[PDB]
């Protein structure tokens, strides 16, 4: 049950991986998880703030 | 093991009314206790028991 | 009392009063001397963590 | 199969078990519920503590002797200092609740006696001096029970309650107290007595400090007796559970 | 996965889940929602570490012994028996009968002995371990013919690499390994009493194939058992007392448990 | 209708009646049956005596005193000299059987006490001298019961059993003996105790003289007590019934 | 003849295994066998006991 | 992949992207094409090295300790705690709560000690490392029975090959490892204050299985942690100050930053 995924290559190829142990805590690190959501910290306000609008009106 | 961060509580027993007996009967009785676990009970982290011990190999 | 069958007996007699205590111990199923040597306690010692509800039956 | 003698009652984190009990008495046919919208008066939103207030509170025990006239308890005052029920009734202005009273007395097959347990609504009591009205320390004793007398209380210039028992303090005939919700504890048959009284009043809610809605009376119509050799100390225990308790009018703590 | 608590409410009924009778030898199956009000909880805990395979399948040292490259004690012998180490013995005795495969691992380590011999320049040591089933010949000396291992299983190991390890199948003339035996060997009800009666497991021998050096060297071998594919029957209570010998269940009477100050004290 | 207290057991030409009994304990969930063909080893044809061997044999009674540590019986040895069961087990080489143990003790409503009845499989016992193993005259006493001790047995150079009771002779904690099939005789509730143990062993059959498969232990966790004027002699009786007994390997009579 | 099974992972991934020896006594331990049946010990009585019922009637 | 700049032109409007109000606790989301004219740029840069898994999944030395083959210090013990090394501690304390698997690697290295003993010819050294979870027995001496590891995890390593390495799952009675704890152990609000309250991780012991030689030898063990499958919550500011102890957050007051000459100076 091999898993084929894509390699980290430049911009402007695949690799194969097999799990050998029955404990999921032995697998390799989850390196490719490029998901970001800065909205919890940068803009935590109750009311939406349009950029091109007076913050206080 | 003993850990304050995970303290369990206290179990106590009290007299509600009294033990009442007639004449020619013993006013002293005994109670017995049995402990067991329910369906939700679980255990983790297998380790060695601090009860058994030995100084030299038995023969 | 640990060197007899009296350790398992909880004495309850007729009391000329009310609301006094019979016994008490902490909810430490594997560390307290009341519980560390019972089947539950014995099995618990081989592990580090426990979870779930407990049954105490009184006869 | 099952029997009618055994019965368990669960409320909050409290369970009451009995193996020799008579049928439960439910008030005037009514089960305690909450106040509806077509019957309310106070406009703000009430708070229902539920499990924290609707549970079994046990009181002190009293000893049943061969010459005990009887005891009584003003129900709302009795619990005014127990757990979160007392605190909620101390921080609020109006309250509403029904009750579940369980009275317990156990003895052997060689003991005899009979106790009347009656929940009397609005048991207004009289004073020994016709001139005045009785004190609050005489009428309601919290954290304890109030004892009746076998002989009439003397008159004078005081504020004592007329605790004569055959008059029930209310100036009536005691044998008629079976017009109210009641239960008999007969030592040869009964073991305990349960009564589930709903909220009785002429207003939708009431202040719980200056008014006592009901009263628990325990009277031994037939005296306690036994033969030399049997147990001589026989106590009586009372456990009260509030039901559908709600509170309205949050204010500062106190009763003045 | 453990059971999930069911949410309950207030009750006033003739049902009696709390009241039972313990004289029937039956454990009450009461859940917490029978004596109080509860909430619905979604339990996700697993009972995956309480399994007998997980509880017993871990390597344990059951014995270790020494031999030398010169002098008198030139080889080591050990009748196979796990009841010398307390830990694994107490784990197995939880049940009356067991049935498992075995995984053997050997940790062989040498040490140089103090002496006055000079110009010592040792070559790598090779060890031989040999298993003799009950009935076969035994090595009266170190350079005897029995070490030819024509049929007897044996392992050659050169010091410096991975420890030797083998797999042993369930070897028993019966249907299960008996942890306890209440009887004798002879029909005359005298002689050997107890589990020593069923201990017909063979013998393990160990030696140096070469001497290595001109100076003295002592090699210690540690044996490790690891049960696999475990089956077990009829659970028993734990030992409580301290073990005394390897062939019998003899003990010294001990108190039920340790004490406290009163029946109301919340402290050990 | 019928009650759960009353129960009759018929085996052979023997009927046991009881009017105050707890539920029957059936082994490890298994009912004693015969050996099947896919599980047998000995090739010849076995003999099943049925009614002649599967019936109730009563043993001697023991007296329950206020200071009795307890008793035990090696089940196979106990009946090795009774009726045709003993004869069949004396003329054959291999045997196989389950059991039905009924323990009886009756007392009044003014007596108290509690006895633990436990069928322990492979109860290997220990010696008072760590150096040796106990004698067969110490371990198994036929036609009688073997008594426990309240104090530890002294050491020396003998072959005595370590009959200390709180250690159960097996060097364990006695309160854990409820891991095996068991039943409690409580004088205020119970009257007798029934246990239906099947054939437990690691081989399909066994010689019945040099090996004891199970053992009956009777221990009074709560002592016997009464007040002056009531009966002082209280006996305990044990009745064992073999079930599905079969024999293989006919030979000359004897055990050597 | 590879055997693909599921790994032991938390709540709220697969692994591959091949047998190399012809003796079944050489395989890995049977770790994932979560089957329990406490009824042989907790309730071994002949007659069923309903929980919300008087044990003695 | 980072966002791509949008090309803009000259504007004359009542829109005010630059003017904002910072008292609302909100960061302005202004792009450069709001205050100037820009060109269209196709950005190809990736944020693949700023991920918490990439930032934290690297092995770090958290401790090292010594033991000997003779004399007094015959074994080594260490209550597991990462707050002894500054680097990994400061990396983790970026967040309030974390949750990760662990990858342990051990670098064991021996050295010969100065002495006057002659004719030294050492055999290969084997080491044992043993983990005791909180509650189990401890090795009072070097040749005690606890080293049988019947249930306790342990690793046997012979000097000369690949360093030993294992995987540890997220071991916590809670839902996350707390890097900071603002409270006490006792309900009486006295006693142990701080994160030492939640440090119930077990103990690690290390020894030589054989002595190897007749002369003295000291072995040092270095422990390396490597978080895997990391989750983190509630980011905090960096330490700034220098650490003092391993059990608390005590510090010595330090200036906000380093200085310069004036408010107009372009030099450190
Ligand atoms: C080259 C070395 C080979 C060694 C082979 C060893 C085979 C014998 C294994 C003995 C296992 C004993 C298990 C006892 C179990 C029990 O009764 O509790
Ligand atoms: C044979 C050696 C086995 C070693 C097993 C070690 C298991 C314990 C690991 C401890 C991890 C501690 C993580 C702390 C994280 C934190 O709170 O910041």
Swiss-Prot record, chains E, H:
Leader peptide range in chain numbering: none
Q: Where in the cell is it found?
A: Virion; Host cytoplasm
Which superkingdom is the protein from?
Viruses
Subunit and partners: Interacts with capsid protein VP0, and capsid protein VP3 to form heterotrimeric protomers. Five protomers subsequently associate to form pentamers which serve as building blocks for the capsid. Interacts with capsid protein VP2, capsid protein VP3 and capsid protein VP4 following cleavage of capsid protein VP0. Interacts with host CD55. Interacts with host CXADR.
Q: What does this protein do?
A: Forms an icosahedral capsid of pseudo T=3 symmetry with capsid proteins VP2 and VP3. The capsid is 300 Angstroms in diameter, composed of 60 copies of each capsid protein and enclosing the viral positive strand RNA genome. Capsid protein VP1 mainly forms the vertices of the capsid. Capsid protein VP1 interacts with host CD55 and CXADR to provide virion attachment to target host cells. This attachment induces virion internalization. Tyrosine kinases are probably involved in the entry process. After binding to its receptor, the capsid undergoes conformational changes.
Name assigned to this protein: Capsid protein VP1
Q: What is the lineage of its organism?
A: Viruses, Riboviria, Orthornavirae, Pisuviricota, Pisoniviricetes
Q: What range of the full-length protein does this chain span?
A: 583 to 850 of 2185
């Amino acid at each position: 049950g091999a898993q084929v995924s894509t390699q980290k290559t430049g911009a402007h190829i695949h690799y194969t991986n097999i799990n050998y142990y029955k404990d999921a805590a032995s697998n390799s690190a989850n390196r490719q998880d490029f998901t970001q959501d800065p909205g919890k910290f940068t803009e935590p306000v109750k009311d939406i703030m349009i950029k091109s609008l007076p913050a206080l009106n | 093991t003993s850990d304050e961060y995970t303290a369990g509580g206290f179990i106590t027993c009290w007299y509600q009314t009294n033990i009442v007996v007639p004449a020619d009967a013993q006013s002293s009785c005994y109670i017995m206790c049995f402990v067991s676990a329910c369906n939700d009970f679980s255990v983790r982290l297998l380790k060695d028991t601090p009860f058994i011990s030995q100084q030299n190999f038995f023969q | 009392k640990v060197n007899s069958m009296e350790a398992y007996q909880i004495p309850v007699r007729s009391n000329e009063g009310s609301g006094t205590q019979v016994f008490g111990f902490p909810l430490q199923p594997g560390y307290s001397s009341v519980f560390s040597r019972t089947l539950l306690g014995e099995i618990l010692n081989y592990y580090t963590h426990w979870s779930g509800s407990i049954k105490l039956t009184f006869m | 199969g099952y029997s009618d003698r055994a019965r368990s009652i669960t409320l909050g984190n409290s369970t009451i078990t009995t193996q020799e009990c008579a049928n439960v008495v439910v008030g005037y046919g009514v089960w305690p519920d909450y106040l509806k919208d077509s019957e309310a008066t106070a406009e703000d939103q009430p708070t229902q503590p539920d499990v924290a207030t609707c549970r079994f509170y046990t009181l002190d025990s009293v000893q049943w002797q061969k010459t005990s006239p009887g005891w009584w308890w003003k129900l709302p005052d009795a619990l005014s200092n127990l757990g979160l029920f007392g605190q909620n009734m101390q921080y609020h202005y109006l309250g509403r609740t029904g009750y579940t009273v369980h009275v317990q007395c156990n003895a052997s097959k060689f003991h005899q006696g009979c106790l009347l347990v009656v929940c009397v609504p609005e048991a207004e009591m009289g004073c020994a001096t016709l001139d005045n009205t009785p004190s609050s320390a005489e009428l309601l004793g919290g954290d304890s029970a109030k004892e009746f007398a076998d002989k009439p209380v003397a008159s004078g210039s005081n504020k004592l309650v007329q605790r004569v028992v055959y008059n029930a303090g209310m100036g009536v005939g005691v044998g008629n107290l079976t017009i109210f919700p009641h239960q008999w504890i007969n030592l040869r048959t009964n073991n305990s007595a349960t009564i589930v009284m709903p909220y009785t009043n002429s207003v939708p809610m009431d202040n719980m400090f200056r008014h006592n809605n009901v009263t628990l009376m325990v009277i031994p119509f037939v005296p306690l007796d036994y033969c030399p050799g049997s147990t001589t100390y026989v106590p009586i225990t009372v456990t009260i559970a509030p039901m559908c308790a709600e509170y309205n009018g949050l204010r500062l703590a106190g009763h003045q | 996965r453990v059971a999930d608590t069911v949410g309950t409410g207030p009750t006033n009924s003739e049902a009696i889940p709390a009241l039972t009778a313990a004289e029937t030898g039956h454990t009450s199956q009461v859940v917490p929602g029978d004596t109080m009000q509860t909430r619905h909880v979604k339990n996700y805990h697993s009972r995956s570490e309480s399994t007998i395979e997980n509880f017993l399948c871990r390597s344990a040292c059951v014995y270790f012994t020494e031999y030398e490259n010169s002098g008198a004690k030139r080889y080591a012998e050990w009748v196979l028996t796990p009841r010398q180490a307390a830990q694994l013995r107490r784990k197995l005795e939880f049940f009356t009968y067991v049935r498992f495969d075995l995984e053997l691992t050997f940790v062989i380590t040498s040490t140089q002995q103090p002496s006055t011999t000079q110009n010592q320049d040792a070559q790598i040591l090779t060890h031989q371990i040999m298993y003799v089933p009950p009935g076969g010949p035994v090595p009266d000396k170190v350079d005897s013919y029995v070490w030819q291992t024509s049929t007897n299983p044996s392992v050659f190991w050169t010091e410096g690499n991975a420890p030797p390890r083998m797999s042993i199948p369930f070897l028993s003339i019966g249907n299960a390994y008996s942890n306890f035996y209440d009887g004798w060997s002879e029909f005359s009800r005298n002689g050997v009493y107890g589990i020593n009666t069923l201990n017909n497991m063979g013998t393990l021998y160990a030696r140096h194939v070469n001497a290595g050096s001109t100076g003295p060297i002592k090699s210690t071998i540690r044996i490790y058992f690891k049960p696999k594919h475990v089956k077990a029957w009829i659970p028993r209570p734990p030992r409580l007392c301290q073990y005394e010998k390897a062939k019998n269940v003899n003990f010294q009477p001990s108190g039920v448990t340790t004490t406290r100050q009163s029946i109301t004290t919340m402290t050990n």
